[PDB]
Design a protein around this ligand. Structure first.
Ligand code: HEM
Ligand SMILES: CC1N[C@@H](C)O[C@@H]1C
Length: 292
């Protein structure tokens, strides 16, 4: 059982959310130093994902709606190690705009990072509502990295994501890096790692990969170029259905952009029931299109 109705923060409209977007964008541009000049984009995208990937379609627990990331249990999920940097980034934003709900902020963080790293436009809907600490999902709902194509397919079923949606979402691994201290994995995925492109499929197909044990004793695929791939990233080219989708995004950047946009909003809106007269989704202007 369990229904979560989108309630619009009172009196709020498009241009209020545009200003929250603009603050995020502005600080993305300003704290350009973090994670050796990668900046905060990647970790905000991942935050926006980890707050949504707790969802379970079966009983409708977890997901982005309740902002339950603010509570110690989920905050200290070992799957979330590193994500405290994104939370702290969003901290002065929440103080400047305390009317916005936690859910809405975390997911807007991701949308803003993507668009500002030159990725697709992702429509976004407000309306998530903080729920209480006892609504916080337990740890272990987010996927393991050490597993195969079969594990991946099964995992994302619980998020109601198909082959195509999964391959699309995964191309976000073009962004940022694994960090040994955070996940037991080390290295970037490509050369353009704070620009949102389809470089993750290009690298899967084009680099020369070798399975190795890393310094945390974990297996990961490394290339002569110094890029890496998680066994789970790598399964996308071992499975015949996934491979064929990898080659399609490798050859069609527009296509990748559109499917990633669809599946990213679907990820962030899983679990949430929008009333028939909720506002339409907002497509925010980037700093650049506002000349800001
Ligand atoms: C089986 C599926 C997935 C696995 C196992 C996985 C696992 C990981 C791991 C272990 C890291 C490195 C954490 C660290 O050491 O800092 C990472 C980074 C990241 N993930 Fe995923 N991920 C998955 C799917 C996704 C999806 C669906 C998205 C978004 C659409 C995403 C977005 C990101 C981003 C942007 C980073 C880099 C963040 C940074 O540089 O700090 N991942 N992922
Ligand atoms: C988890 C990731 N895989 C590589 C491709 O870069 C991402 C950070």
């Amino acid at each position: 059982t369990l229904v979560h109705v989108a309630s619009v923060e009172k009196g709020r409209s498009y241009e209020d959310f545009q200003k929250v977007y603009n603050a995020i964008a502005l600080k993305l541009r300003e704290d350009d130093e973090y994670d050796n000049y990668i900046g905060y984009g990647p970790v905000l995208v991942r935050l926006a994902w980890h707050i949504s990937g707790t969802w379970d379609k079966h009983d409708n627990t977890g997901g982005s709606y309740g902002g339950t990331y603010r509570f110690k249990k989920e905050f200290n999920d070992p799957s979330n190690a590193g994500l405290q940097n994104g939370f702290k980034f969003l901290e002065p934003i929440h103080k400047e705009f305390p009317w916005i709900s936690s859910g809405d902020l975390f997911s807007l963080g991701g949308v803003t990072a993507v668009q500002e790293m030159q990725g697709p436009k992702i429509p976004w809907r407000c309306g998530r509502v903080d729920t209480p600490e006892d609504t916080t999902p337990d740890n272990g709902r987010l996927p393991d990295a050490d597993k195969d194509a079969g594990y991946v397919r099964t995992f994302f079923q619980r998020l109601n994501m198909n082959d195509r949606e999964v391959v699309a979402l995964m191309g976000a691994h073009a962004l940022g890096k694994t960090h040994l201290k955070n996940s037991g994995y080390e290295g970037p995925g490509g050369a353009a790692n704070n620009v949102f492109t389809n470089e993750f499929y290009l690298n899967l197909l084009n680099e020369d990969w070798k399975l190795e044990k890393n310094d945390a004793n974990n297996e990961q695929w490394d290339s002569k170029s110094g890029y890496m791939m998680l066994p789970t990233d790598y399964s996308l080219i071992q499975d015949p259905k996934y491979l064929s989708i990898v080659k399609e995004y490798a050859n069609d950047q527009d296509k990748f952009f559109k499917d990633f946009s669809k599946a990213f909003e679907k990820l962030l809106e899983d679990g949430i029931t929008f009333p028939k007269d909720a506002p339409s989704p907002f497509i925010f202007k980037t700093l650049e299109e506002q000349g800001l």
